[PDB]
Amino acid sequence: RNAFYRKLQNFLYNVLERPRGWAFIYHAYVFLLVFSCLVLSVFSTIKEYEKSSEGALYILEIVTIVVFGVEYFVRIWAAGCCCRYRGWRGRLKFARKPFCVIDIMVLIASIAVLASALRSLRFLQILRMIRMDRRGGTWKLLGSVVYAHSKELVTAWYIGFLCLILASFLVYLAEKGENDHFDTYADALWWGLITLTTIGYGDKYPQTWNGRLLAATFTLIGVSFFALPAGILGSGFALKVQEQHRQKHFE
Amino acid sequence: RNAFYRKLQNFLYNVLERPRGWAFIYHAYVFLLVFSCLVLSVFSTIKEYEKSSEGALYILEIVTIVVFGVEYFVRIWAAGCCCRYRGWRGRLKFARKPFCVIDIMVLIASIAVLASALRSLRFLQILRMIRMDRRGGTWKLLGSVVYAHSKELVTAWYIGFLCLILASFLVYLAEKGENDHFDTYADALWWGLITLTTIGYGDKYPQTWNGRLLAATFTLIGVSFFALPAGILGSGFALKVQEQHRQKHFE
Amino acid sequence: RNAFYRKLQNFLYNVLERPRGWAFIYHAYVFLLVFSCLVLSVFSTIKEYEKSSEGALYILEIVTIVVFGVEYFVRIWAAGCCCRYRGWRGRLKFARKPFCVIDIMVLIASIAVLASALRSLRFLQILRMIRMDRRGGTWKLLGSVVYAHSKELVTAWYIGFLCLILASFLVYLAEKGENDHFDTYADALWWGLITLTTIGYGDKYPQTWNGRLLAATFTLIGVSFFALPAGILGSGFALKVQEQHRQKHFE
Amino acid sequence: RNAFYRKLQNFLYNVLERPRGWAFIYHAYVFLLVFSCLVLSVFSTIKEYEKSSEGALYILEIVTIVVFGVEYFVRIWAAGCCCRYRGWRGRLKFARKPFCVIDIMVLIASIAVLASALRSLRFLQILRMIRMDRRGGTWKLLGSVVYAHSKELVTAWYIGFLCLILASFLVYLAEKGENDHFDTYADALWWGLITLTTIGYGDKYPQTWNGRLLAATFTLIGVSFFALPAGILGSGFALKVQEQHRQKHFE
């Protein structure tokens, strides 16, 4: 009962901790439970189905509190696999990690809330989602690629920003008298910011052929400068994965 | 009459089966007949031209049933080219393939429908389109490239999802009292989901300068995080074709 | 007066013909005259400024007919530089090229129109724009890159098309009774086609939480599959220019 | 007091001038002061909060004039580090640079305005933003990448422009009689230009099944040709940074 003790310790703190193979199954399904619990929290908002959803939602709240209670327990046990955290002092200190203690705090809030309250449960659910990280890996990856392309990006942010201010001002001048949409500069900026991202709600549009004519030039330019940073970062991620691909195919 | 027998067997089960050269002509034109049959099925919906289209549509239904009846026949014959499926047992078992039997089932439904019915014919037409694959090659290609970029993508899905929930909640707080668009959280989420994809129907827009001010920041961020996965996959497909290009230029 | 004869022949049929250096100046400015002539043709449409624009437009029509008359003359003369088309037979046959004869036909139509008419002049102006090519180089380049990526693209066109038909049908079912936007399938297809491209006019939007819920899933998928082919072709052009870059840096 | 004199000269004309490390902190924070001063200039437009913002804005105007006055002073002093501009003649001529003299002119306008006026201060603030460059580096980078891809781009601009004119004309013909949106060609062009960029305000949309049918084809094409140049330039920037990456990893 030692090699089984020690084996299951290894593979469990493989799955619970940094997971490799089929542990992504478990990490996806725990994501599903926290996620669907957040969704039913949204169904609580509709007063026409508030009572029905609330019925099922306390129940799924039951299961979610039980799931993460046991997950907290099980990880603390299978954390014996750490060669630095072993037996007494390890497992008595491992729950002292930063993420772990905030995690137990979020979990205990989950515990009491079942023992104005819904604000608390919506937020703790969100921290389950953000609890997905435990490392900030996503933030690290995004920061790296944003850093590598700082000159190209800042080129796009500067030139796009200028096109916004310019086009908004011109349209404001041409359509300040004959239109009620463009009453003050702040309205012309809302209009510029909402066309250049190609959202185009339709609540403010120019209606004199001068406004149409000036928007039509800075539009053709600006809408393509607001769409660069998505294009630049998209290519950056793909290129970076190709390089990590080959580098890893060797080492 | 053997070498002609055997020649036309080869080139026909080249064209009907895995096609190389001018067989893409035939596969495109059969796609046209199934496609245009689906379109006339849509024209059936307009009651102002329902009768005219329905007139022509039973006729093109005639041709389509005849075409695929003969295609079923001709492929079963020219399937003698299979070195594993030869004469009796092959051609008597080749129609036992999974895709082939579902194909004959869809075809026989086509046969009876010309012998509440229009629901059946719209669906069988759809299965002609999905019958285009016979291999799931498109699904394989998409799955490969989605798999290769799982870390970059999940970075985008996580950070975009957070920006959605955050911006929707802030705008909901700033514009819950002075506006009828944002009545419940579920409305604020519909608004967030429809601006961040830059659809912008225009049915819900913020109208207090607090809502405009908070949307204008998470908008500039979010609309570019919802547009990544198209950008990442787009670069992924192009890069992958370049690598298959060179690799094949050798081997 | 021979070396000057022959020199200016060379550099002129350099500029007029396949241009290298500062001949792009001339080709841009001739593009400006044809272009601005088309624009004033559009100003003719507004009856409030029809007369003013029409005033200036016959005048710029004067200059444009004179410009291209002389260009036709000058190119036919400087075409002596062709080692195959020399003196009598060359310059007497060079105007027999396909593009040249259609060009003289368009020019002569320009001549007579100044000697229901505006339909003719709008069209001939368009053929000046399309006359920019003379080779179909742009069509060749686009066809090459579309050809190279046929498998990735057709993956996107197939999967996007399916998502359209599917989402439109589901939304049609959920919102056929409680809404006047979605009356027939053809309306649901117009709605699907206009959200998935993220145009979003706002004339048709779902208004029952079932329609919002089903659109919100196929939206998140579809809007990113309709945006691939721009992303794929965009990366394709950039990659191809890098390869032609290095290849030419050698040879 | 010489080595301290000379040391701080070096590191200061490192930070103020071409900055390397933590000088980006200072250059970001000076960007914040000019930027937030522009924003409060916009809050001046809303007459409901005009007085409150104007209150705080003269104050932040105080700090901004003092900041750039001292920056002008301090840079002129620490400009002794220039091996060509040293002591008397250098520091007496260094303020004779083009950017420096326009900068002092903008600064002195800032000085007098605190000693119809708001038009002047909004513009000078803008020139602080454009003063960020001092070199046109962003313009240089954009021009380089636009130049490198001139053939692919002009392919996109030509083919997209044709699709615009074509689709707008067809829709104009099909929906000129039965609709008030499309009254003249100029309206059909506004509609075409605003759908093809996927803005889609919603003020003009086709409403006869002929207009819907013709828009639906040139839409599927055009909206993807208007989105190329963002895609091409996006890939161009990313590719170019990868090449500068490796080249610099060597030299």
Ligand SMILES: CCOC(=O)Nc1ccc(NCc2ccc(F)cc2)cc1N
């Ligand atoms: C992808 C990460 O987030 C983005 O890079 N997005 C983004 C950021 C800025 C801009 N434009 C410049 C601008 C700056 C300030 C302003 F107040 C207004 C406009 C465009 C985009 N797409």
Ligand SMILES: CCOC(=O)Nc1ccc(NCc2ccc(F)cc2)cc1N
């Ligand atoms: C291309 C294949 O499909 C996509 O990757 N598309 C996509 C998927 C998700 C997101 N955002 C995150 C999100 C997640 C859940 C939610 F309920 C709401 C938002 C954005 C896009 N474009």
Ligand SMILES: CCOC(=O)Nc1ccc(NCc2ccc(F)cc2)cc1N
């Ligand atoms: C860039 C050159 O043109 C494009 O490749 N564009 C494009 C073509 C098709 C699709 N979707 C599939 C579809 C097919 C048929 C239909 F009737 C409806 C939808 C999307 C885009 N963007």
Ligand SMILES: CCOC(=O)Nc1ccc(NCc2ccc(F)cc2)cc1N
């Ligand atoms: C990124 C830098 O700016 C752009 O390249 N943008 C852009 C420029 C033109 C076009 N279309 C062609 C056209 C030309 C003239 C016209 F009067 C109307 C249409 C599309 C885009 N996106």
